[PDB]
Amino acid sequence: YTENGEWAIDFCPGVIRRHHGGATDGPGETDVIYSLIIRRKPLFYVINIIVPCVLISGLVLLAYFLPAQAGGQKCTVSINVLLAQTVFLFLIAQKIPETSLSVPLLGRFLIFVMVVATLIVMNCVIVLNVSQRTPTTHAMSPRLRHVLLELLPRLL
Amino acid sequence: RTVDRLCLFVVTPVMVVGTAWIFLQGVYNQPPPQPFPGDPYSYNVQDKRFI
Amino acid sequence: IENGQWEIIHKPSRLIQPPGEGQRQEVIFYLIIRRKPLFYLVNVIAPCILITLLAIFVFYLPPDAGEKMGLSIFALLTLTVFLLLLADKVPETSLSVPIIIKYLMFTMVLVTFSVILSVVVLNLHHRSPHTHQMPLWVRQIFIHKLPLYLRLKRPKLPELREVVSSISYIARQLQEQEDHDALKEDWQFVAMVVDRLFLWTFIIFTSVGTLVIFLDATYHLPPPDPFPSR
Amino acid sequence: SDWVRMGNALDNICFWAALVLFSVGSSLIFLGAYFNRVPDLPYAPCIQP
Amino acid sequence: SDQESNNAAAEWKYVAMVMDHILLGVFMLVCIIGTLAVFAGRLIELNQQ
Amino acid sequence: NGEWEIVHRPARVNVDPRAPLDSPSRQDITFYLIIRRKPLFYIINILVPCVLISFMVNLVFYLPADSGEKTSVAISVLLAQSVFLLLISKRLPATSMAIPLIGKFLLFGMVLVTMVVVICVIVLNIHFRTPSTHVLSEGVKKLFLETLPELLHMS
Amino acid sequence: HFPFDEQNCSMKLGTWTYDGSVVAINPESDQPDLSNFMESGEWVIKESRGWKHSVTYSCCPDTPYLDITYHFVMQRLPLYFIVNVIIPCLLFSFLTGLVFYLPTDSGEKMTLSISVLLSLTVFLLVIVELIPSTSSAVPLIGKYMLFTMVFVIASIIITVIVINTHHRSPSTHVMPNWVRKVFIDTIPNIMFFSTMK
Amino acid sequence: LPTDSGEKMTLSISVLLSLTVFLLVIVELIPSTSSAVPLIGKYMLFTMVFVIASIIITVIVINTHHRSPSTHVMPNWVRKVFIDTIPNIMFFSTMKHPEVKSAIEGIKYIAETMK
Ligand SMILES: *[C@@H]1O[C@H](CO)[C@@H](O[C@@H]2O[C@H](CO)[C@@H](O[C@@H]3O[C@H](CO[C@H]4O[C@H](CO)[C@@H](O)[C@H](O)C4O)[C@@H](O)[C@H](O[C@H]4O[C@H](CO)[C@@H](O)[C@H](O)[C@@H]4O)[C@@H]3O)[C@H](O)[C@H]2NC(C)=O)[C@H](O)[C@H]1NC(C)=O
Ligand SMILES: *[C@@H]1O[C@H](CO)[C@@H](O[C@@H]2O[C@H](CO)[C@@H](O[C@@H]3O[C@H](CO[C@H]4O[C@H](CO)[C@@H](O)[C@H](O)[C@@H]4O)[C@@H](O)[C@H](O[C@H]4O[C@H](CO)[C@@H](O)[C@H](O)[C@@H]4O)[C@@H]3O)[C@H](O)[C@H]2NC(C)=O)[C@H](O)[C@H]1NC(C)=O
Ligand SMILES: *[C@@H]1O[C@H](CO)[C@@H](O[C@@H]2O[C@H](CO)[C@@H](O[C@@H]3O[C@H](CO[C@H]4O[C@H](CO)[C@@H](O)[C@H](O)[C@@H]4O)[C@@H](O)[C@H](O[C@H]4O[C@H](CO)[C@@H](O)[C@H](O)[C@@H]4O)[C@@H]3O)[C@H](O)[C@H]2NC(C)=O)[C@H](O)[C@H]1NC(C)=O
Ligand SMILES: *[C@@H]1O[C@H](CO)[C@@H](O[C@@H]2O[C@H](CO)[C@@H](O[C@@H]3O[C@H](CO[C@H]4O[C@H](CO)[C@@H](O)[C@H](O)[C@@H]4O)[C@@H](O)[C@H](O[C@H]4O[C@H](CO)[C@@H](O)[C@H](O)[C@@H]4O)[C@@H]3O)[C@H](O)[C@H]2NC(C)=O)[C@H](O)[C@H]1NC(C)=O
Ligand SMILES: CCCCCCCC/C=C/CCCCCCCC(=O)O[C@@H](COC(=O)CCCCCCCCCCCCCCC)COP(=O)([O-])OCC[N+](C)(C)C
Ligand SMILES: CC(C)CCC[C@@H](C)[C@H]1CC[C@H]2[C@@H]3CC=C4C[C@@H](O)CC[C@]4(C)[C@H]3CC[C@]12C
Ligand SMILES: CC(C)CCC[C@@H](C)[C@H]1CC[C@H]2[C@@H]3CC=C4C[C@@H](O)CC[C@]4(C)[C@H]3CC[C@]12C
Ligand SMILES: CC(C)CCC[C@@H](C)[C@H]1CC[C@H]2[C@@H]3CC=C4C[C@@H](O)CC[C@]4(C)[C@H]3CC[C@]12C
Ligand SMILES: CC(C)CCC[C@@H](C)[C@H]1CC[C@H]2[C@@H]3CC=C4C[C@@H](O)CC[C@]4(C)[C@H]3CC[C@]12C
Ligand SMILES: CC(C)CCC[C@@H](C)[C@H]1CC[C@H]2[C@@H]3CC=C4C[C@@H](O)CC[C@]4(C)[C@H]3CC[C@]12C
C-alpha cells in the first residue's frame, strides 16, 4: 500500500444493512456499506496559499507606522495588499469546492482578511485627512484635539 | 501644460475615431440575406419550390 | 479542411525496409508543417516590444517626478502577466528552450536592470551633500569628460550691534545654503549624466539583443527538401 | 504640528485595534480547524501500524 | 505678491475640497442605492415565497 | 442556444461532376447552419470595461504634473489591458487567418497607451527643468507660452 | 436572477417508434420518486411533478403520440456566489468612494482609485470563470459587476477633475464668479460648516 | 533606494505583487501534492518571506528616517551604535520711536527663527 499524496485513510468500517422488510414493503433488501474516513494532508495549501496570504494580509498593519504625509505611501501599502488578496481569490477559486451548504475555511479567512484590509484602508484615509489639515482650509476642532491629545494619554 | 493640452486634443480624437472604426466593422457585420452568394433562393419554408 | 495554425510544406511517403524472420517493413507518411505565428506576434511579441520601449524611456524620466520605480516595476508586473499568458501555450519539454521564452526572459532581465539602474540614479540624485563628499575622480569623469561625449552642456549702541549681528548671521546662513545647494546641484548633475549614459547603453543593448533574437527567428526557414543530407 | 500629532495618536490607537481584530479573527478561524480532528471512533485503524 | 498668490491658490483648494465632500456623500449614497436596486427586488420576492 | 441564433438553415444535394460514379465522394447531402453570435455576454463583461479603461489613459493629460501620478495611471491602464489580453487568449484559437476585432482594438489600445506613457515621460521631463540643468530659449517661450495657448483657447 | 435564480427543468420521455395506438404509457405516480434522492450541495428541488400528454397531428388523426414529461422546479443555493463574488464587489464599491475623503496633497488619490480598478480587473478572471457565459440575458451578478466597474471609472474621472481643480493658481487660471458663489458661499452654508471659508 | 525618493514602498510592494502574480504561474506549472515540500516550493516560500521581511524592515527604516526632532528624542544607545561605531567599519561622513524698536525686534525674531 502506498498512501495517497493528499489523503490518509484513518478508518474504514463496514456494516451489513437490512431494510424494507415491512409487510407493506414486501421483500427485504440488503446491502453492505463501507465508510472510508479519510484525512486531508494540508501541506500544499499551507505552504502555497495560506502562509503567503497570512503574511501579505498582515502587511496592512505596517501602514500605521508609515508617516501621514505625501511621501508616506500608507495608502500604497494597504490597497496593494488588497490587490494581492484579489489575486489570491483568483488562486483559491481554482481549488475550493463549488457547493453552498457551508463556506470553506480558506474562503472565510480570505474574506475576513479582505474586510480587515478594507477597514484599514478607510482608517488610513481618515488618518491622512486629519493629519494634513492646514489653517487655510480647516479650523482647529478643539473637541477632537482635547479628546486625542489630553484624554487619550490619560486613558493609556 | 501647453504640451499636455495639445497632446490631449491630438491623442484623444485619434483613440475615439480608431475605436469607433474598429467596432463599426463588427457592429455592421451581418450574415448575407441569402445563405449562398449568387443564389437568390432563400431556402425557407415560406418559399416552397413546388415541382 | 485547411488548418488555421499550420501550413503543409512537404508531405512525402516512404517504404522503410527492416535492418538486414520476424522482420517487418513500414510505410511512413511524413507531414512537415510550419506554424503560422500571427497570434503570438499580436498577443506576446508586440506587448513585449512596447514594454521594452517603456523600460528604455524610464531613463528620460526626471528623478524629481518620483515615478521611475512605479513605471519600471509595473512594466515587470505586466511582463509577469504575459508569462502567465504563455504558461498555457508553450511546450513542457526540457531538451531546449523556446525562442519566445528566451525573448521573454531577456525582456524581464532588461526590465530588472532598468529597475536596478534607476535605483542607482535615484541614489546619486538624492545624495545628501553634507554626509557624502564627492570624490574627485567622480568629478573629472561625470562632470568634465563624459558630458562632452553625451552632448550634455551644463549651463554656465547695543541695538545697532545686535542688528548687525543678526544681519551677519542671516547672510552667513544664506551663504551656507548656497554652498549646500551647489554641492547638491553637482550630485544631481552627476545623476543626470549617469542617467543619460544608461539611456544610451540600454538603447544599444535592447536593439542588439532584439535584433539578434528576431533575426534568429526570421531566418529559421522550413527545409527545402524533406530528406536533407546529414 | 497639532494636526500631525492628532493623526499620530489616531494611528497609535488604531494600530492596536487592527492588530487585535486581525489576530483574534484569524486565530478563531484556524482554531475551528484545530478542534476538527477525526473523531476517536470505536474501530481499529484502517492500516495496521 | 506671493501671499496674494497663495490666497488665490487656497481658494482653489477650498473649492476642490468642497467638491470632494459632496462627491464622497454622492458616491456612498450611490453604492448603497445601486446595491439595493440590483438585489433587493429579487431578495424581497424570495422572502415572500 | 444561449449564445448562437440560427439565421439560415439550408439543405442541399451536392454532386461532384469530376468524381467518378463509383466514388463515395460523388454525392452528399449537406445541411448548413449559418449562426450569428449573440454578443451580449462579451459586450457587458469584456468590451465596455476594456473600452472604458483604455479611454481612461486620456485623463492623464488633464492631470497636473505636480500630482506625481501620471505615469502610474498610464502604466496601470497598460497592465489592465494586458489582463484583458490574457482573458481573450483562452477563448479563441491561435489561428492566423485574421486578427480578431477585440484583438485589433486591444493592440491599438496598448500601442496608444504606450505612446501616452512616452508623452507623459516627455511632459514630466519638460516640467521639472531648471536653469541649473536646461536653458529656456526665447523661441520656445514664444511658441509654447503665447502662440499655442492662444490657439488652444487655454485659460 | 442568477445566483438567486429558480430553474424549471423537464425530462420528456416517450416511445420513440411506437405511437399511442400500439403502445400506451401511463405515469406510475403524479410525482417522481425522490425517496432515494441524494442531497445536492448546489440546488433544492422545491417541486416535482409528472404529466402525460397526447398530441394528434392532422395528417395522422388515428395514431396519437404520447409522452410523459417529468419537471423539477429547482432553487439555486447562492451562498458560494455570495461569498466568492458579491462580497468582493461590495468591498470594491465601498472602497471607490473613499478617494473623495483623501486629501489631494496626500499624492495618493490616483493610487487608491487605480488600484481599486486593477483589483476589479483581476477579479474579472474570477467572475468569468465562475459566471456562466450566456447571452440570453444579463445576470444580476453581471449587472452588479458592470455597476461597480462603471462607477469606479466615474470616480477616477471625477478625481482627475478634482485634482486639476486643487492645483490651480493665479499663474494658470482666474476663478470665475459662479464657482466662487456656488462653492465658497452657498454650499458650505447648507453643510456642517466646520470648514473655514 | 533613498527614503527621500518616496518610492521605497512602491518598489517593495510591487515586487511583492509581481511575485504574487507569478504564484499563479507556479501553481499552473509545478504539481500540487502534500506528500512533501518540493525544492521549488522551498525556494518560493523563501523568496516570499524574503520580500515580506524586506517590506517590514523598509517600513522600520522609513519610520526612522521621518522621526521628528520635537516629539522623538534620539536615545544615546542609537547614537553610540549607528553614528559612532558602525561607520568606522564603512566609509560615510558622520553627522528711538516704537516702530524702529519693533523693526529691530523683528530682525532679531527672524534670526532666532532661523536658529
Ligand atoms: C460515516 O458515515 C456512516 C454512514 O452514513 C455513518 O454510519 C451511519 O450513521 C447513521 C447516522 O448518521 C446511522 O443511522 C442510524 O441508524 C440507526 C438504526 O436504524 C435502524 O433502527 C432504527 C430503530 O433503531 C429504525 O428507525 C431504522 O428503520 C433502522 O433499520 C437509527 O436508530 C438512527 O436513528 C437516530 O439518529 C437519527 C439521526 O441520524 C435520528 O433522527 C433518530 O431519531 C435517531 O436518534 C440512525 O438513523 C447508520 O446506521 C450508521 N451506519 C451505517 C451502516 O450507515 C458514520 O457514523 C459516519 N461517521 C462519522 C464519523 O460521521
Ligand atoms: C457556407 O459554406 C458553403 C460551403 O460549405 C457555401 O456554399 C457554397 O456556395 C458557393 C456559392 O454559391 C458554391 O459555389 C458555386 O458552385 C456551383 C456548382 O459547382 C459545382 O459544379 C462544378 C462543375 O460545374 C464543380 O466543379 C464544383 O465542384 C461543384 O460540384 C457553381 O456553378 C458556381 O459558379 C457560379 O458562381 C461563380 C461565383 O464566383 C461564378 O464565377 C460562376 O461563373 C458561376 O456563375 C459556384 O462556384 C459552392 O459550391 C457552395 N458549396 C457547397 C458545399 O455547396 C455557402 O455559400 C456559405 N455561406 C455563406 C458564406 O453565406
Ligand atoms: C523527418 O523525419 C524523418 C524520419 O526521421 C527523416 O527521414 C530521415 O532522413 C535522414 C536524412 O535526413 C535519413 O538518413 C539518411 O539515410 C540515407 C540512407 O540510409 C539508408 O541505408 C543505410 C544503408 O543500408 C541504412 O543503414 C539506413 O538505416 C537507411 O536505410 C543515408 O545515405 C544518409 O546519409 C547521409 O547522412 C549521414 C548522416 O550521418 C552522413 O554521414 C552521410 O554522409 C550522408 O550525408 C542519411 O543517413 C533517414 O534514413 C530518414 N529516415 C527515414 C525513415 O526515411 C526526415 O529527413 C525528417 N525531415 C526533416 C528533418 O526535414
Ligand atoms: C415546468 O415545466 C413543466 C412542463 O412544461 C410544467 O408542466 C405543466 O404543468 C401544468 C400545471 O401542472 C400542466 O397543466 C395541467 O395539465 C393537466 C394535464 O393536461 C394534459 O392531459 C390532459 C388529459 O389527457 C389533456 O387533455 C391535456 O391536453 C394535456 O395533454 C390538466 O389536467 C390540468 O388542468 C387542470 O388545471 C387547469 C389550470 O389552468 C384547469 O383549467 C383545468 O380545469 C384542470 O383543473 C392542467 O392544464 C401542464 O400540462 C404541464 N406541462 C407539461 C409539458 O408537463 C410545469 O408546470 C413547470 N413547472 C413550474 C414552472 O412550476
Ligand atoms: C511618443 C511619441 C514621440 C515623442 C513625442 C513628443 C511630444 C512632445 C513634444 C516635444 C517637444 C518639447 C520641446 C521642449 C524642448 C525645447 C527646447 C529644445 O528643443 O532644445 C533643448 C531641449 O531639447 C529637447 O528636449 C528636444 C525636444 C523634446 C524632446 C522630447 C523627448 C524625445 C522624443 C523623441 C522621439 C521619441 C520616439 C520614440 C517614442 C515613440 C536642447 O537641449 P538638449 O539637452 O540638447 O536636448 C536634448 C533632447 N533629447 C534628449 C531628446 C535629445
Ligand atoms: C465580513 C466578516 C465579518 C466575515 C467574513 C466571513 C464570512 C464569509 C462568514 C462570517 C459568518 C459566516 C456564516 C456563519 C454561519 C453560517 C450558518 C451555516 O449553516 C452556513 C454558513 C453560514 C451562513 C456562514 C457563512 C460564512 C460567513 C458569512
Ligand atoms: C465612446 C465611443 C465614441 C467609442 C467608439 C467605439 C464604440 C463605443 C462605438 C463606435 C460606433 C458605435 C455604434 C454606432 C451605431 C450604433 C447603432 C445604434 O442602433 C446603437 C448604438 C451603436 C451600436 C453605436 C454605439 C457603440 C459604437 C460601436
Ligand atoms: C472571522 C471572524 C471575524 C468571525 C468568526 C465567527 C464564527 C463564530 C463563525 C465563522 C464561520 C462559522 C462557521 C461556518 C460554517 C459552519 C457549518 C455549519 O454546518 C455549522 C456552523 C459553522 C461551524 C459556523 C459556526 C460559526 C463560525 C465558526
Ligand atoms: C462608451 C460606451 C458606449 C461603452 C462602450 C461600448 C462598446 C464596447 C461598443 C462596441 C460595439 C457596440 C455594440 C454594437 C452594436 C450594437 C447595436 C445594438 O445591438 C445595441 C447596442 C450594440 C450591442 C452596441 C453596444 C456598445 C458596443 C459593445
Ligand atoms: C446605470 C449604470 C451607471 C450602472 C449600472 C450598470 C449598467 C451599465 C447596467 C445596469 C442595467 C443594464 C441593462 C440591463 C438589461 C439590458 C437589456 C439588454 O438589451 C441587455 C443590455 C441592457 C440594456 C443592460 C445594459 C447595461 C445596464 C444599463
From Swiss-Prot, chain A:
Residue spans crossing the bilayer: 42-66, 75-93, 109-130
Annotated disease: The muscle AChR is the major target antigen in the autoimmune disease myasthenia gravis. Myasthenia gravis is characterized by sporadic muscular fatigability and weakness, occurring chiefly in muscles innervated by cranial nerves, and characteristically improved by cholinesterase-inhibiting drugs. Myasthenic syndrome, congenital, 4A, slow-channel: A form of congenital myasthenic syndrome, a group of disorders characterized by failure of neuromuscular transmission, including pre-synaptic, synaptic, and post-synaptic disorders that are not of autoimmune origin. Clinical features are easy fatigability and muscle weakness affecting the axial and limb muscles (with hypotonia in early-onset forms), the ocular muscles (leading to ptosis and ophthalmoplegia), and the facial and bulbar musculature (affecting sucking and swallowing, and leading to dysphonia).
Phenotype for residue 86 to P: In CMS4A; markedly prolonged channel openings in presence of agonist; as well as opening in the absence of agonist
Subcellular location(s) per record: Postsynaptic cell membrane; Cell membrane
Purpose: After binding acetylcholine, the AChR responds by an extensive change in conformation that affects all subunits and leads to opening of an ion-conducting channel across the plasma membrane.
Cytoplasmic side: 67-74
Top-rank taxon: Eukaryota
Extracellular side: 94-108
From Swiss-Prot, chain B:
Domain of life according to the entry: Eukaryota
Membrane-spanning intervals of the chain: 6-24
Subcellular location(s) of the protein: Postsynaptic cell membrane; Cell membrane
Family note: Belongs to the ligand-gated ion channel (TC 1.A.9) family. Acetylcholine receptor (TC 1.A.9.1) subfamily. Delta/CHRND sub-subfamily.
Disorder cited: Multiple pterygium syndrome, lethal type: Multiple pterygia are found infrequently in children with arthrogryposis and in fetuses with fetal akinesia syndrome. In lethal multiple pterygium syndrome there is intrauterine growth retardation, multiple pterygia, and flexion contractures causing severe arthrogryposis and fetal akinesia. Subcutaneous edema can be severe, causing fetal hydrops with cystic hygroma and lung hypoplasia. Oligohydramnios and facial anomalies are frequent. Myasthenic syndrome, congenital, 3A, slow-channel: A form of congenital myasthenic syndrome, a group of disorders characterized by failure of neuromuscular transmission, including pre-synaptic, synaptic, and post-synaptic disorders that are not of autoimmune origin. Clinical features are easy fatigability and muscle weakness affecting the axial and limb muscles (with hypotonia in early-onset forms), the ocular muscles (leading to ptosis and ophthalmoplegia), and the facial and bulbar musculature (affecting sucking and swallowing, and leading to dysphonia).
Organism in which the protein naturally occurs: Homo sapiens (Human)
From Swiss-Prot, chain C:
Binding partners and assembly: Pentamer of two alpha chains, and one each of the beta, delta, and gamma (in immature muscle) or epsilon (in mature muscle) chains. The muscle heteropentamer composed of alpha-1, beta-1, delta, epsilon subunits interacts with the alpha-conotoxin ImII.
UniProt superkingdom: Eukaryota
Disease linked to the protein: Myasthenic syndrome, congenital, 2A, slow-channel: A form of congenital myasthenic syndrome, a group of disorders characterized by failure of neuromuscular transmission, including pre-synaptic, synaptic, and post-synaptic disorders that are not of autoimmune origin. Clinical features are easy fatigability and muscle weakness affecting the axial and limb muscles (with hypotonia in early-onset forms), the ocular muscles (leading to ptosis and ophthalmoplegia), and the facial and bulbar musculature (affecting sucking and swallowing, and leading to dysphonia).
Record's subcellular location: Postsynaptic cell membrane; Cell membrane
Functional note: After binding acetylcholine, the AChR responds by an extensive change in conformation that affects all subunits and leads to opening of an ion-conducting channel across the plasma membrane.
Family: Belongs to the ligand-gated ion channel (TC 1.A.9) family. Acetylcholine receptor (TC 1.A.9.1) subfamily. Beta-1/CHRNB1 sub-subfamily.
The name this protein goes by in its record: Acetylcholine receptor subunit beta
UniProtKB/Swiss-Prot annotation, chain G:
Location in or out of the cell: Postsynaptic cell membrane; Cell membrane
Expression sites (tissue/organ): Isoform 1 is only expressed in skeletal muscle. Isoform 2 is constitutively expressed in skeletal muscle, brain, heart, kidney, liver, lung and thymus.
Membrane-crossing residue ranges in chain numbering: 80-100, 112-132, 144-164
Extracellular domain ranges by topology: 133-143
Cytoplasmic compartment spans: 101-111
Top-level taxon in the UniProt lineage: Eukaryota
Residues of this chain annotated as glycosylated in UniProt: 8
Disulfide bonds: 59-60
Associated disorder: Multiple pterygium syndrome, lethal type: Multiple pterygia are found infrequently in children with arthrogryposis and in fetuses with fetal akinesia syndrome. In lethal multiple pterygium syndrome there is intrauterine growth retardation, multiple pterygia, and flexion contractures causing severe arthrogryposis and fetal akinesia. Subcutaneous edema can be severe, causing fetal hydrops with cystic hygroma and lung hypoplasia. Oligohydramnios and facial anomalies are frequent.
Similarity field: Belongs to the ligand-gated ion channel (TC 1.A.9) family. Acetylcholine receptor (TC 1.A.9.1) subfamily. Alpha-1/CHRNA1 sub-subfamily.
Protein name: Acetylcholine receptor subunit alpha
